[PDB]
Amino acid sequence: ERPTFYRQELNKTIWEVPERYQNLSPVGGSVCAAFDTKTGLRVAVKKLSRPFQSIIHAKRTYRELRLLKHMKHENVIGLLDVFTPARSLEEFNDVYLVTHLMGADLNNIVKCQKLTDDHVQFLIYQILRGLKYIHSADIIHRDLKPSNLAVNEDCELKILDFGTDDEMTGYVATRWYRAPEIMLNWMHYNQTVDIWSVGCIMAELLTGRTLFPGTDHIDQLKLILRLVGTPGAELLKKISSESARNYIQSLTQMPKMNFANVFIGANPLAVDLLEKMLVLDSDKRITAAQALAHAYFAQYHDPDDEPVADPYDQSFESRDLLIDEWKSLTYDEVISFVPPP
Ligand SMILES: Fc1ccc(Oc2ncc3c(NC4CCOCC4)n[nH]c3n2)c(F)c1
């Protein structure tokens, strides 16, 4: 049966939610912290803003719901609930998404300081465990950074936000964790972009400092190539962008630096893993599954406790539909939702 809904204005927006959700408080569509009286969980409730205003927006709403409904893993943000106050498809215009409330993000944890090697092991282990799962469903995060890695008091981690030009401009953390092939659109990229991001994050946990804090795209590329070396003939061929390939060749060649001299005092196993993650040629980067079996994670690794995902049908991604068609599909997904045990 349909629960009773009550109304409240919070972010100059009217939130209409089931009675079970109490003490709604803004934290950041708009997001509110709340207490789910049915489960006893502290939750985050996200109300999507104008979910069906255009074809692009309607498809994005469907995409986010499909992604969240699929993810069922300890280290990945999943759906506790999804609801609409609408009683029918014709009334349907708002979507609310509910997940676990996490206390902080990784930026709050690092706070300009070094973490202990054990803390780094545990945090990177969980990220990679979550990524193995996400990647196994043929999903790419594409935008991994400390701000979308949420953590509780016990350092337990979940991945958020998986799946404009102005905000990528300049001295900005929005670009610092991006693989060079996507920052400069070198080629058709794949899952390996996420491993680059993990490398950048891991380095920052170890040193307390941004690995590649570029002041712009070009400055960042220079910082990258100084560490990992300029591309060889092999990688150059794979840069399908003739323009990008042409620019790359104009740069003075540089050898790969010694990572042990860059990361002074770090666990030699951490240095080794960083060398395997921060490879310029994406074809040759370590995968999440391979990284989990690396000696650095010896105390956490368990091949029987690192699950993969059920098949994820994303044929909708190459489909062209009307607004009302994406809207109907979204409605079907809301109505059919089954809460976790
Ligand atoms: F179903 C969802 C999916 C993602 C959502 O977005 C979101 N945003 C944020 C959080 C959060 N905590 C953040 C962590 C970073 O600092 C601010 C609070 N815990 N859970 C969260 N979920 C959401 F609210 C509902």
Q: Where are the domains positioned within the chain? A: 1-103+309-338, 104-308
**Residues 167, 189: Cα–Cα separation, whole Å:** 21
**Residues 241, 107: Cα–Cα separation, whole Å:** 34
**Probe residue for ligand 1, chosen from 10, 11, 30, 46 as the CB with the greatest number of ligand atoms within 8 Å:** 46
Q: Is the CB of 44 under 6 A from ligand 1?
A: yes
Query: What CATH class is the domain 104-308?
Result: mainly alpha
Tokens representing residue 267 in the block = 């666990």
Classify residue 197 by burial, with Cβ atoms within 10 Å: 0-12, 13-18, 19+.
buried
Q: Are 57 and 29 in contact (CB under 8 A)?
A: no
**Closest Cα partner for 132 from 275, 327, 279, 301?**
301
Helix 117-136 with 192-207: angle, nearest 10 deg: 170
For 163, residues 6+ apart whose C-beta sits below 8 A from its C-beta are 63, 64, 67, 139, 140, 141, 142
Q: Is the CB of 161 under 6 A from ligand 1?
A: no
Residue 203 phi, psi (nearest 5): -55, -45
Q: Which superfamily, per CATH, for 1-103+309-338? A: Phosphorylase Kinase; domain 1 (3.30.200.20)
For this PDB entry, the determination method is: X-ray
Residue 286: which region, alpha, beta or left (left: phi > 0; alpha: psi -120 to 50)? beta
The residue type of 284 is K
Interstrand relation of 157-159 and 104-105 (parallel, antiparallel or unpaired) = unpaired
Closest protein CA for atom 5 of ligand 1: 46
Q: Are 26 and 15 in contact (CB under 8 A)?
A: no
Cα–Cα distances (Å) from 197 to 13, 192, 242, 247, in that order, read: 35, 9, 25, 24
Catalytic (active site) residue 161? yes
On whether 114 is known to bind a ligand per the annotation, the reply is: no
Question: Other CB atoms closer than 10 Å to residue 105's CB: what's the count?
Answer: 17
Tell me which residue has tokens 């950074």. 145
Q: Are 45 and 24 in contact (CB under 8 A)?
A: yes
Q: Which of 117, 161, 219, 272 is catalytic?
A: 161
**Residues 239, 257: Cα–Cα separation, whole Å:** 23
Resolution (Å) of this entry: 1.9
Tokens representing residue 226 in the block = 């100084």
Tell me which residue has tokens 């070009």. 218
For residues 25-58, b (16+ Cβ closer than 10 Å) or e, as one string? eeeebbebebbbeeeeeebbbbbbeebbeeeebb
